[PDB]
């Protein structure tokens, strides 16, 4: 078992950043394959041994990550991505913080050569494929915690940005199908978990708190002056007094930018806050340079000298109160004892300035001249109030400066990382946060691929997944996605001369285009199955009404939707819309397309689509369908003015007979019927037929007597 | 797990009638929860189609043979797998016919060693081991190849002779 540790240390020595030039790349790809095989043979039980677990966790992920961003060849990158994916699949339970950084850097390189991006996508693809619940599982395991990134949503956002045909310049032609496979697999996963559960039964508080926190962080970074009382508004703080607000800043400094705190503390009105900000920290038993280092880790230095003056004043004044006074044993023979020095406020104030100068000139590259060790000790001759500092004071600080510089790129970011570590119905409920933050993007990309592409096979899969998305939006009560889907499909159907089995401009445009066929079928396939009318909005009602009216414009839709009403009231069928010329010009390819359209509408069950099922029968449909009436003769629409009015009227009578609100809604439709009945000299049969409907409305309504009087008179 | 086969499928797909078979194989093995009832001749048949034919360059054949060796070494096919006997029959059967510079033949020889020496090699039909012995003897007797491959041939034939005559007990 020690042999295993020695062998894995040797494999670490094979592949690493430091041991780059010694061994060739054939050795490195071979070592990657070896580590892959070692993980594969036993990875479930590899976690138990901590001496080995540190070796496979901490220092080998360095070798993994360092040669994704920096490498340029393809062969090594293949094996490294193989090892990475196997590590994700096998050891996904633990090893959670380190993996997030490499996914973040993966998407960073992906979003911003050609073949390398294809290899990246093609290799990382298997995570969603072999684990269809990967997007959910990463959300449970990683997203729900308050801290860390939010790369679960960014995964789908990155796939969405990569999915379009617009990425020809960014990536080669193989990427879009590969990412679109997982993009469609996401929606296809949900129908597996829908069959069991009904709508009414359904009808992550930590995530709610995280959303509140992230919005507060965004506002606080945008404007701390308003953000502070806004932070009090959310109840995350004890009170307005500066003690609690100052306590908030130190604990959660990892997420906040340094510049925000720097500009917040710079203003003169908030200088009193510095009386209590530094009071929390206490550097007793530590030298001034270490305390200055911890201070510089917490915020960024300003640029203006006058602004810097008050900050240095507060910093220097804060140290004095921490330490008491025992200075009577001044001497130069001391060997690392601090308490003998107990300077005044001015002494620490002057001591602060000379310490910071070494970083921005000697270590800075722009300035070439160097002020030596001589002139630094030469500066303060008789500057600390008539008595000089001891000459062993500055040498220790200069030695402490010379070892390491302060940092306000890649290696240093790991330093904060390890310090964090070292020191069925329920799934649906935990769902509904995924779709809210990605749904518009997913439907936009699906529609973009559907409208740009031309192959039938891709488009059928697209429209089916589109219907899956529509069902998903229907199960919850989003009512912003669903209207977008149905409205854009309504635009996409392509229904917004001498005819004869008619032939028409809209008909021939329908038949010649395959795109409209699937849209018209699947659209009323959505309308067939529904469980509430309120999700529809006014615009979609206008769209479907315009669809049915445009179909009535030609002899496509047979207006015999309700034979029961006509058989009750004993009228013939409504008069057909009277086309031009009839015999059995067009020839060859004109008719053969259009007849197919005459087939396809019959496949939609258009009569029983929106009117058949009772779910869509509501006040909105009647109220807008009466608005749809033209009420105006024109030479352009003289073909069908006499018939559209009768069709609309009878269709509304049948619709109103179903609704049980038999008190209010009848008044509006009776009003519009009598307003419609007085058109300019409409023909005899129309006025003949309209009075039967008018008597029926008078029967339906209650206490509508004036209209009956006018009807008689 | 049994996710290794899909990974090798995407690895071999980068070759730029067989690519269609491999993509069908990937779409089929999207399925989870082990290989299960899969009729295990078909889980790896397109790999045998690569090595069996004689119209593909050596690089793809080497990749396919590496995939086969990976499957056997990790023991993807086991006693629990349906029709494992037929699959391990077919994999030795295909290698005897035409193939393919010399490293490909050594890979075939090493895989033959590993298959025959293991327990599953006992399940091969007695009409097949003669073909394997004929192939290895043709490699060993011929001198046009490199000498080190001939020595590898010598060692494998000694090993499989010991394994065969041990069964005579």
Residue numbers in the entry:
A (entry chain A): 329 to 440, 455 to 545, 554 to 758, 768 to 782, 799 to 871, 889 to 892, 903 to 986, 1007 to 1135
B (entry chain B): 11 to 26, 71 to 154, 162 to 230
Paper text:
The budding yeast homologs of GBF1, named Gea1 and Gea2, localize to early and medial Golgi compartments where Arf1 activation orchestrates the formation of COPI vesicles destined for the ER and earlier Golgi compartments. Here we present cryoelectron microscopy (cryoEM) structures of full-length Gea2, the yeast paralog of the human Arf-GEF GBF1, that reveal the organization of these regulatory domains and explain how Gea2 binds to the Golgi membrane surface. Gea2 and its paralogs possess an N-terminal DCB-HUS regulatory domain and C-terminal HDS1, HDS2, and HDS3 regulatory domains. The HDS1, −2, and −3 domains form an extended helical repeat structure that is contiguous with the DCB-HUS domain, such that the HDS3 domains of each monomer lie at the distal ends of the homodimer.
Three-dimensional classification of the particles revealed three distinct conformations of Gea2 homodimers that differed only in the positioning of the GEF domain, with each monomer adopting either a “closed” or “open” position relative to the regulatory domains. Based on the relative numbers of particle images that sorted into each of these three classes (~30% “closed/closed,” ~30% “open/open,” and ~40% “closed/open”), the conformation adopted by each monomer within the dimer appears to be largely independent of that of its binding partner. Strikingly, a closed conformation of the GEF domain was not observed in the Gea2-Arf1 complex cryoEM data; instead the position of the Arf1-bound GEF domain was similar to that of the open conformation observed in the absence of Arf1. In the closed conformation the entire GEF-HDS1 linker is ordered, whereas nearly 20 residues (residue numbers 781–798) at the C-terminal end of the GEF-HDS1 linker are disordered in the open and Arf1-bound structures. For example, for a portion of the GEF-HDS1 linker in the open conformation, the cryoEM map density of some side chains is not well resolved. In contrast, the closed conformation, in which the GEF domain active site is oriented orthogonal to the membrane surface, appears much more suitable for productive encounters with the Arf1-GDP substrate via diffusion than does the open conformation. The structural data therefore suggest that the Arf1 nucleotide exchange reaction involves conformational change of its GEF from the closed state to the “open” state.
